[PDB]
Amino acid sequence: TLECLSRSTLLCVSALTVISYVTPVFLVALLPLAVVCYFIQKYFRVASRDLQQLDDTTQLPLLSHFAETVEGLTTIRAFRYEARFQQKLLEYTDSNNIASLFLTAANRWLEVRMEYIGACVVLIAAATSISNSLHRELSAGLVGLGLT
Amino acid sequence: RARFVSKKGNCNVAHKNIREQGRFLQDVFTTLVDLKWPHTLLIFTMSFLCSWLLFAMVWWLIAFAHGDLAPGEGTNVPCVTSIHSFSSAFLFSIEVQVTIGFGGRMVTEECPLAILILIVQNIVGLMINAIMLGCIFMKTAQAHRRAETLIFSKHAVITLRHGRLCFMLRVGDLRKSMIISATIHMQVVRKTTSPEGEVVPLHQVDIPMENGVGGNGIFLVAPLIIYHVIDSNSPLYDLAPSDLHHHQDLEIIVILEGVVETTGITTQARTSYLADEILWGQRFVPIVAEEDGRYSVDYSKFGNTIKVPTPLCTARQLDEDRSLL
Amino acid sequence: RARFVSKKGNCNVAHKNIREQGRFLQDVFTTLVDLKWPHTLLIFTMSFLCSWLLFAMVWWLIAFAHGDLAPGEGTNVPCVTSIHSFSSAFLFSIEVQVTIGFGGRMVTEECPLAILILIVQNIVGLMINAIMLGCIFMKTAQAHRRAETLIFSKHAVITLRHGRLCFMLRVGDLRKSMIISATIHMQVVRKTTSPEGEVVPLHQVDIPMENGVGGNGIFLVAPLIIYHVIDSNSPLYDLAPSDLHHHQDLEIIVILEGVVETTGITTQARTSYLADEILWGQRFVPIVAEEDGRYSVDYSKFGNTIKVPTPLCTARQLDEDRSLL
Amino acid sequence: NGCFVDALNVVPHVFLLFITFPILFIGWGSTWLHFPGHNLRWILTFILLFVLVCEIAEGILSDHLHLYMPAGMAFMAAITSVVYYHNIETSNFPKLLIALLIYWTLAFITKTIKFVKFYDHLRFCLTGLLVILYGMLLLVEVNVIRVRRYIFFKTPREVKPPEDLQDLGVRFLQPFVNLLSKGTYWWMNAFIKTAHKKPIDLRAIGKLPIAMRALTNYQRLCVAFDAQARKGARAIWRALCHAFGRRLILSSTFRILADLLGFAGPLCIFGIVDHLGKNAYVLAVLLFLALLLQRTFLQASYYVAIETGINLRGAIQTKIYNKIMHLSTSNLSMGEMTAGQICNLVAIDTNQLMWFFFLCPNLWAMPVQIIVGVILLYYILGVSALIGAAVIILLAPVQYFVATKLSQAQRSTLEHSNERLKQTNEMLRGMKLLKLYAWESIFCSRVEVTRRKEMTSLRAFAVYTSISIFMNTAIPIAAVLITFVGHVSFFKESDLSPSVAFASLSLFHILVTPLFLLSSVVRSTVKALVSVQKLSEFLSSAEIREE
Ligand SMILES: Nc1ncnc2c1ncn2[C@@H]1O[C@H](COP(=O)(O)OP(=O)(O)O)[C@@H](O)[C@H]1O
Ligand SMILES: Nc1ncnc2c1ncn2[C@@H]1O[C@H](COP(=O)(O)OP(=O)(O)O)[C@@H](O)[C@H]1O
């Protein structure tokens, strides 16, 4: 994970630097992208922290219950309370599942809006390219770098 | 057998030997409003087109009669300038009637007869426009759709509350809009024979709605079971539990009156319960439930019913047993 | 915990499992009136512009189709004289629709299709004008701003009057306009369990408004504390003073009904008081004061309250002590 | 009379846009009812959006306002049809549907007239597809009236909106929303906005849907397990793959479509560069649309994979908890049914099976991806394909051998860590007696020796992964260099226009990304294999004997 993160951040740096070099005008369209992305990341951060905390606080009691059922076997199978204990475990596992599901759903939502942000940036990067680097800049080699 | 007033609220009794001559065009002016929006739009466009065609015909006739319709240059001025055929005549009629006034065809100061036909055309048009506006506004003001939402459980039950036999029946609202000062007039009909040898074919008697210290009205927010307790003084106190299901003919009607908020009109809902409809010794399922942070009402259990181990006996014999126990 | 009806007067109970198909365009004709004056003006201009543009488009189309839009001299007469582009077509549409009739561009008696489009344009315009006038007048007639002024002190108190425990709660007017025949329906809700094993989730019961010989109504000029005395027959007579503050769930609602003067509609105000809202053993400060030559009412002391050395005990135990003293 | 037919087409869009505004403004001023063809309707509406973009492109190429207005009007007409269908999904009516049906019929008529007048004499295709799409939406509307109550006899016999996902008390609605929203998780908006206003709680978050409860997953899983038994470690694996089924397959199909579009992007780059060297803005718009579409479908695939994984976790958790009941204490006395061993089972197998079931749809698209990559790069390289082909064929077998040498270390790693955990368990529950007469050095040296063996396994794994990354970078760069040098001067004699160069670099990067990933995938793959072997040996413990 650490190495993939480093590779991806260096790729992002390279791409931003290349696009800035090919079209010195793009620095007028980068700050709104950064601002909107920053605000949405800030909004996602608190909800993500809350969902992770709730995930942990529901995941602990399920494993406590598992251990206690495993050790105190004879008593539970003596009372013949097995229906009650299975119902209890069903309750706990359903709560665990919903917590995990909401965490991953928030993850997916942030990813989707980030991909829309990336679509915006690549779109208007290519648009400013096809416009400026052809009409007024008249440069050929920079187009390939920019779009790639 | 025959019912007194139907479940939907409409009346069942059909009148015979009515007199004559009722509704001399005023109740027809209101029966017109009563008709459904499509039929009312149809009759409105019908009236308008009828008047338009009538006056178009008379204008074509007068232009033909003066000779101005005969195409000729000089020795005359047409009473209505630039009129050629029936089409332009109808165009002039719709131009002067609905008050658009194109002015391509001009009525002139040569013929006073055209002046008279115009001076009657305009006033009749204004009068028909005024009635057709007032009537559509009057029709618009009502709200029947808001009125027909009153709901009463299909069958009513009896139970034993506070050691006394009681009548339980559900009412309720179906929209956000409330109903102000809703009162209950609970009545019972029966073919009765007086001790003086007089037989009445149907006898309405008020059975009380048991509320607080007094009051004939209630307050409707959630489905509230109307709670009455039959006592030795009540007229319904004499019947038996095994004879009601099949043979007897007893109609218990409720009349819930109340004024709606937005319109301010006083509507009501009337419903009947027959001898074969009502049943014995049961209990409704609790509707309201403590939800997340509110009260949840489930209308699926509205007409649901559970068995209750309650004694089955007649109200007179039940009162005698209460005197004995 | 959950409340029955909110302080502002709106209802809190949320319905579930409602049926279907209610409000088949008539309740939408009234929900339109309900919307705020800005939204209603927006939708009115929207409807008008929609119809105008629709018929302008169809007129430009028909003038294009006949070939009269193709600029040519002779061999034809345009169905609408002097029509050149879409701009003049829209001008003709607004000239014939809203019935101004400039008459610079004249519809002729050569094309009956233009006659038909005009004869439908005018009737649809008249119908939409009639509905948009009736609806704005109907909306105008109401007065909600006059309705929402009812005020009830935030918390109600209990005191000892005439040797009996009593309920004191302030009401009042906020405008010069009076309210005719205002009646009080004072009710209490509670989750009750009958002796027959029946548990109700909420139980409305009428607690009387204690006035003269009779009467369910009052007269509102100045803030008048509604005066009720709980007795052994009252449903509220059984509670305790130390258990109401925190644990118990008792909602005491008041429903003040009455018809306003100028409009004649019957409005009402509903408010709730919880177990944690109501307090014990206090007295309101006298509002009215003998001014220079009138009576001055100070609304700053409306919700103010002073301590009173009154005994604190349950109403059942208080009645037992009254039997002992 | 071309302009005449253009106007005749403009008319019905205007009619619909004018009737939509009163109703839309009343509606703009909690039971979801769905109709058959809903998803088909939204799919067709997106196809309409695309074809309308193409029509606008044609209108730009030709220009004459009245000649390209029909596209700009059908655009708002389709968006307003979407608004109508949202207003009908939220509250059902028999009349709004007829209001749509009228417009569909009239638009079909106008398009037919256009087609005839064209036949008598690029436009043809765009127009033909338009007519076909209008016709299919018409058939959908006819199906809808055939179903419940457009005019049909008296009562709809209407469904009674679904209580499974509409039951009071539910917060999570993925299955209970509209076609277009599921991709974006628009429903989440409220929730994420709410969370900031008030902290989140378990009573805040809802319950689980009808089709999400662990009871039904356990039910399905046991039914499949029984069917498999009537026909061991392999059997339960077959049962798992069977049970998730169609959802898992769908996740794979979404990923494959996303992959084909992801390859499509670089082709648009090639076209843009070629026109820059010399039908270009269309390339930008189409490229933007393609990128957006790939992102949407990739995220949907990830979501459905996660769904399948969480359901797997729930089902196997409840299955092993039910089986713990019938387990006999004579197994509990043995090391195989150690309590610490069973809790390690639950926790780490939840983890490993969930991670493998998130990464399995990702690898069920690597083969199709690489195949399409090479079939695309042939048409771009030409006779210079041999070098890249030899490179990406020389990559595979050495990678297979490296992965084998990796898995062998990883399995022994797991065995050693599993014994270390039990040594720690028996070390911590007796720290009192341990510190009492100070036997610490012995147990600490034993755990240190176990840690050293585990570290040997880990260092073997790490050296092998380093060699893997070295290869996965060195072979690619050599490939690019060789191919380009070969084309320019070695044989081809056709000057590589920069478009070819950059498109090759793009496709090549797309090919490179999966290879780096598969090395990490093996780490979860052998772990899933080991976890299932352990789970099957745990299920094979001694039963309790019924009287
Ligand atoms: N869930 C509901 N929501 C609104 N109205 C209802 C509902 N169920 C029934 N109604 C109406 O109110 C009346 C209540 O009767 P009901 O309890 O349904 O007994 P039944 O099922 O035999 O008709 C019915 O006549 C029906 O028209
Ligand atoms: N001076 C006033 N004039 C008019 N209305 C008032 C005045 N004071 C309060 N009200 C309204 O009437 C109600 C009386 O409650 P109040 O006596 O003010 O207790 P509190 O101060 O705790 O709100 C309040 O809800 C308020 O909206």
Residue D14 touches partner C, C-beta closer than 8 Å: yes
Buried/exposed B85-102: b ≥16 CB within 10 Å, e otherwise: ebbbbbbbbbbbbbebeb
What residue spans in chain B does CATH classification 2.60.40.1400 cover?
Answer: 1-13+143-325
Q: What is the 3-state secondary structure (H, E, C) of C5-69?
A: ECCCCCECCEEECCCCCCCCCHHHHHHHHHCCHHHHHHHHHHHHHHHHHHHHHHHHHHHHHHCCC
- 8 A C-beta contact, residue B222 and residue B287: yes
Domain C14-142: which CATH number of 1.10.10.350, 3.40.190.10, 3.40.50.1820, 1.10.287.70: 1.10.287.70
Distances in Å between the Cα of D530 and the Cα atoms of B169, B240, D332, D344, D415 are 66, 77, 22, 13, 10
Give the count of beta carbons closer than 10 Å to the beta carbon of residue B58. Answer: 15
Looking at CA atoms only, how far is residue A148 from chain D in angstroms? 6
Looking at CA atoms only, how far is residue A60 from chain D in angstroms? 10
The Cα D64–Cα B234 span in angstroms is: 88
Give the count of beta carbons closer than 10 Å to the beta carbon of residue B67. Answer: 12
**Neighbouring residues of B306: CB distance < 8 A, sequence distance ≥ 6:** B282, B283, B284, B285
Please give the angle made by the CA atoms of C253, C259 and C261, to the nearest 5 degrees: 140
- C-alpha D90 to ligand 1 mean position (Å): 23
- 8 A C-beta contact, residue D182 and residue D174: yes
Cβ-based burial of D360 (10 A; exposed 0-12, middle 13-18, buried ≥19) = buried
The Cα B48–Cα B61 span in angstroms is: 20
Give the count of beta carbons closer than 10 Å to the beta carbon of residue B19. Answer: 5
Residue keyed to tokens 């009904």: C257
User: Considering Cα of D264, then D265, then D268, then D274, what sign does the dihedral take?
Assistant: negative
- 8 A C-beta contact, residue B293 and residue B322: no
**Neighbouring residues of A21: CB distance < 8 A, sequence distance ≥ 6:** A142, A145
Q: HSE (CB half, 13 Å, CA atoms) of C39?
A: 14
- 8 A C-beta contact, residue A45 and residue A144: no
User: Considering Cα of D370, then D371, then D376, then D380, what sign does the dihedral take?
Assistant: positive
The Cα C22–Cα D92 span in angstroms is: 10
Smallest Cα–Cα separation from D498: which of D511, D487, D513, D510? Answer: D487
Chains contacting D (3+ CB pairs below 8 angstroms):
A, B, C
What residue spans in chain C does CATH classification 1.10.287.70 cover?
Answer: 14-142
Give the count of beta carbons closer than 10 Å to the beta carbon of residue D453. Answer: 16
Experimental method: cryo-EM
- Taking CB atoms and an 8 Å cutoff, what residues of chain B touch D169? 291-292
The SS3 of residue D422 is helix
**Neighbouring residues of B142: CB distance < 8 A, sequence distance ≥ 6:** B263, B265
- C-alpha B277 to ligand 1 mean position (Å): 15
- 8 A C-beta contact, residue C98 and residue C124: no
Smallest Cα–Cα separation from D183: which of C239, A111, B172, C156? Answer: A111
Smallest Cα–Cα separation from A48: which of D196, D205, D183, D298? Answer: D196
- C-alpha B302 to ligand 1 mean position (Å): 7
DSSP-assigned letters across all residues of D447-496: HHHHHHHHHHHHHHHHHHHHHHHHHHHHHHHHHHHHHHHIIIIIS--S--
Which two three-digit tokens encode residue C107? 């519809």
Q: From the centroid of its chain, how far is CA B129?
A: 27
Residue keyed to tokens 């044609």: D58
Q: Where are the beta strands (DSSP E) in chain C?
A: 14-16, 157-161, 164-169, 179-189, 192-193, 199-200, 205-206, 226-229, 251-260, 266-273, 282-284, 288-290, 295-297, 305-307
Q: From the centroid of its chain, how far is CA D180?
A: 15
The Cα D103–Cα D106 span in angstroms is: 5
Buried/exposed A92-130: b ≥16 CB within 10 Å, e otherwise: bbbbbbbbbbbbbbbbbbbbbbbbeeebbbbbbbbebbb
Q: Note whether A touches C: 3 CB pairs or more under 8 A.
A: no
Which two three-digit tokens encode residue B169? 């029946």
The SS3 of residue B226 is strand
Ligand with smallest separation from the Cα of C16: 1
The Cα D173–Cα D171 span in angstroms is: 6
The Cα C81–Cα C106 span in angstroms is: 5
* C164-169 and C157-161 beta bridge pairing: antiparallel
Which two three-digit tokens encode residue A69? 């059922």
The Cα B84–Cα C108 span in angstroms is: 11
DSSP 8-state secondary structure symbol assigned to residue C105: S
User: Considering Cα of D287, then D288, then D289, then D293, what sign does the dihedral take?
Assistant: positive
* C164-169 and C226-229 beta bridge pairing: antiparallel
- 8 A C-beta contact, residue C97 and residue B97: no
**Neighbouring residues of D407: CB distance < 8 A, sequence distance ≥ 6:** D522, D526
The Cα C222–Cα C296 span in angstroms is: 10
Provide the H-helix boundaries in B161-271: none
- 8 A C-beta contact, residue A45 and residue A106: no
The SS3 of residue D283 is helix
Resolution (A): 5.2
Q: From the centroid of its chain, how far is CA C253?
A: 18
Question: Who among C39, C47, C64 is closest to D7 (CB)?
Answer: C64
Which two three-digit tokens encode residue C319? 């009645």
Distances in Å between the Cα of D410 and the Cα atoms of A118, D461, D463 are 38, 7, 12
Longest dimension (CA), chain C: 116
DSSP 8-state secondary structure symbol assigned to residue D37: T
The SS3 of residue D521 is helix
Smallest Cα–Cα separation from D476: which of D391, D402, D398? Answer: D391
Give the count of beta carbons closer than 10 Å to the beta carbon of residue D328. Answer: 15
The Cα B283–Cα B306 span in angstroms is: 5
Smallest Cα–Cα separation from B189: which of B98, B251, B256? Answer: B251
Gyration radius of chain D over CA positions = 31
Mutate to test the pocket of ligand 1, among B279, B285, B302 (most ligand atoms within 8 A of CB): B302
- What is the interface size between C and D, counted as CB pairs within 8 Å? 39
Distances in Å between the Cα of B78 and the Cα atoms of A46, B75, C83 are 86, 10, 27
The Cα D103–Cα D87 span in angstroms is: 17
Mutate to test the interface with D, among B288, B292, B294, B295 (most CBs of D within 10 A): B292
Instruction: Tell me phi and psi for residue B318, to 5 degrees.
Output: -65, -40
**Neighbouring residues of D468: CB distance < 8 A, sequence distance ≥ 6:** D399, D402, D406, D519
The Cα A85–Cα A93 span in angstroms is: 12
Provide the H-helix boundaries in D486-545: 498-539
What CA dihedral angle connects D184, D185, D190 and D194, to 10 degrees?
A: -120
Q: Where are the beta strands (DSSP E) in chain B?
A: 157-161, 164-169, 179-189, 192-193, 199-200, 205-206, 226-229, 251-260, 266-273, 282-284, 288-290, 295-298, 305-307
**Neighbouring residues of D530: CB distance < 8 A, sequence distance ≥ 6:** D352, D411, D414
Smallest Cα–Cα separation from D41: which of D107, D108, D134? Answer: D134
Which two three-digit tokens encode residue A84? 């009650």
Which two three-digit tokens encode residue D185? 């998780």
DSSP 8-state secondary structure symbol assigned to residue D538: H
The Cα C274–Cα C250 span in angstroms is: 6
Smallest Cα–Cα separation from B241: which of B300, B157, B322, B139? Answer: B157
Distances in Å between the Cα of D506 and the Cα atoms of D363, D377, D448 are 21, 10, 49
- What is the interface size between B and C, counted as CB pairs within 8 Å? 183
Q: Where are the beta strands (DSSP E) in D157-236?
A: none
Q: HSE (CB half, 13 Å, CA atoms) of A62?
A: 23
The Cα C313–Cα C322 span in angstroms is: 12
- 8 A C-beta contact, residue C66 and residue C79: yes
Smallest Cα–Cα separation from C318: which of C280, C284, C291? Answer: C280
The Cα D269–Cα A144 span in angstroms is: 8
Which two three-digit tokens encode residue D4? 């005449």
The Cα D310–Cα D318 span in angstroms is: 12
The Cα D333–Cα D106 span in angstroms is: 80
Which two three-digit tokens encode residue A145? 């770098």
DSSP 8-state secondary structure symbol assigned to residue B227: E
The Cα D132–Cα C57 span in angstroms is: 27
Residue A97 touches partner D, C-beta closer than 8 Å: yes
Q: What is the 3-state secondary structure (H, E, C) of D183-199?
A: HHCCCHHHHHHHHHHCC
The Cα C309–Cα C282 span in angstroms is: 8
Smallest Cα–Cα separation from D469: which of D426, D507, D512? Answer: D512
The Cα D324–Cα D344 span in angstroms is: 14
Q: What is the 3-state secondary structure (H, E, C) of D86-154?
A: HHHHHCCCCHHHHHHHHHHHHHHHHHHHHHHHHHCCCHHHHHHHHHHHHHHHHHHHHHHHHHCCCCCCC
DSSP-assigned letters across all residues of D368-387: HHHHHHHHHHHHHHGGGHHH
In the sheet that holds B295-298, the strands lie side by side as: B288-290, B295-298, C14-16
What is the CATH code of the structural domain delimited by C1-13+143-325? Answer: 2.60.40.1400
Cβ-based burial of B159 (10 A; exposed 0-12, middle 13-18, buried ≥19) = buried
Q: Note whether B touches A: 3 CB pairs or more under 8 A.
A: no
Residue keyed to tokens 């115009």: B118
Instruction: Tell me phi and psi for residue B273, to 5 degrees.
Output: -135, 120
The Cα C136–Cα B137 span in angstroms is: 10
Which two three-digit tokens encode residue D14? 């205007």
- Amino acid (one-letter) located at D164: D
Distances in Å between the Cα of D364 and the Cα atoms of D305, D329, D508 are 12, 42, 20
- C-alpha C300 to ligand 2 mean position (Å): 8
